Amino acid sequence: IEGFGVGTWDLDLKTWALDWSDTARTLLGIGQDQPASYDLFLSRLEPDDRERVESAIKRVSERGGGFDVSFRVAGTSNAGQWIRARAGLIRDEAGTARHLSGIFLDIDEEKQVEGALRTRETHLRSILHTIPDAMIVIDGHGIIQLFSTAAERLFGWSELEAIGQNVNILMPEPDRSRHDSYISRYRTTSDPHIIGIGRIVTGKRRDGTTFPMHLSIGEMQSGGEPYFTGFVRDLTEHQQTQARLQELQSELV
Amino acid sequence: FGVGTWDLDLKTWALDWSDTARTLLGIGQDQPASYDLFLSRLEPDDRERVESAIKRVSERGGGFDVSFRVAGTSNAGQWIRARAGLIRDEAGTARHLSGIFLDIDEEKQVEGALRTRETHLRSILHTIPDAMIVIDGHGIIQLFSTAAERLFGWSELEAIGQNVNILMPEPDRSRHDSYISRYRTTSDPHIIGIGRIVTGKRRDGTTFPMHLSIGEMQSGGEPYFTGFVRDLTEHQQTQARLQELQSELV
């Protein structure tokens, strides 16, 4: 009754009478002196939301596994109050269901977090598609987790084809069979290793051909598992113009 | 109703919960409710917090909301947010504390997803070999990778909030804001994705040739551009030395 921070409400399917808590009045942004009314409640929600609330009450009117819908109000000039209305069915007797009761929750923090994740997910899509160098993300066991657009073009495998496979499918032997051991060896020593030391190695495409490449790796930790983000740089063109330059330089010396 | 209800009156120290409330805590249907059993589902760290929280609500009365995870079904857990308020028997006596149990497994799953994304972003910014810059729809720098700090001579704290034009020489420096707005208004076959060689300028005042790849995205009604800068100083010196050796032989 006091404090809490959550509002409560009550509504009867028959006679459409509504009674909300004092803490719930503040959530709706109106109600300093006006009494509670079903019409007043639907007058605060936006038109599309109002329709959703009506379908929800009808859904719970006939059967209905609970009631929970979220909507935003126009409480302040440049901000909205996100509210998650939850309610439950309580019948009088075996005859009918006469009054739905529930609570009003403030989900402003929950919506800000949801939005933040959406922005991050969208950005990752953009990065994966835009980045010119092949970007590959593996897990502690070498299982590919992300495979950028450039990785597809360079290695010949699509993301759907590469995700879930071991990163060793991108290299020829003997590295292919010994790569798994290379990862487990680094996870035990835990010293300032080749992570951040670009060394040139050779990768293999699905095609079967091979090419010289430089890789940069960055480690991260999440949920008890480490993940490695690789950035591949193809050196085929660099090594050939460097060879033709060092060959056209030896035509006189 | 997928929410639980419960009340722990300070007087008599009893505790009764609803049917959905016991299912959330992972308690047998036959077992009876009690304050002792409730604290037995929480782990020691969480248990201490709830007890100190109850001691604080009694000696204040400003509500009580705590989140914890119980070992519901071995492998994983059930995240529960317990929120409650206190009812007063008389003018100066607080007697009951009533509230609800909420399932926050999905809410906690979103928090963890965001955290992984934020940690991965920091990893990319620190590890990406090419300079990575992210700007808003008005050219204001939002993100500045480690490589961008070394190439342009600005720190991420110094660069963030500045117009991206501080990295360019004239005349691009003055017309860059126009290239952005003329793109947003007439978005069609522009050079966003096609990267021609452009000239960048470090904080020194020194300039270098560069190629840039851009990617656009939308978030909250506003566009954002992610650029990847590739310094062409070495590439140009190399191929310039190719024509300085292929034409000198006449």
Ligand code: HEM
């Ligand atoms: C595509 C061709 C690749 C080849 C041929 C290759 C080969 C190798 C080799 C030879 C080593 C050991 C170096 C040494 O002991 O001197 C190594 C280590 C390692 N590689 Fe790969 N690698 C490739 C791609 C990747 C990618 C894309 C990632 C991660 C996204 C990765 C993750 C690792 C890790 C975590 C280690 C151990 C840590 C370290 O020593 O730096 N590899 N790899």
Ligand code: HEM
């Ligand atoms: C630092 C050196 C940079 C220079 C010298 C430069 C210069 C230019 C030039 C010459 C154009 C095209 C004008 C035309 O089409 O006639 C342009 C357009 C544009 N640039 Fe930049 N730019 C630089 C960096 C960036 C960065 C880092 C970003 C974003 C991350 C960016 C975003 C854009 C956008 C959004 C447009 C308009 C869309 C388009 O026409 O492609 N620029 N800039």
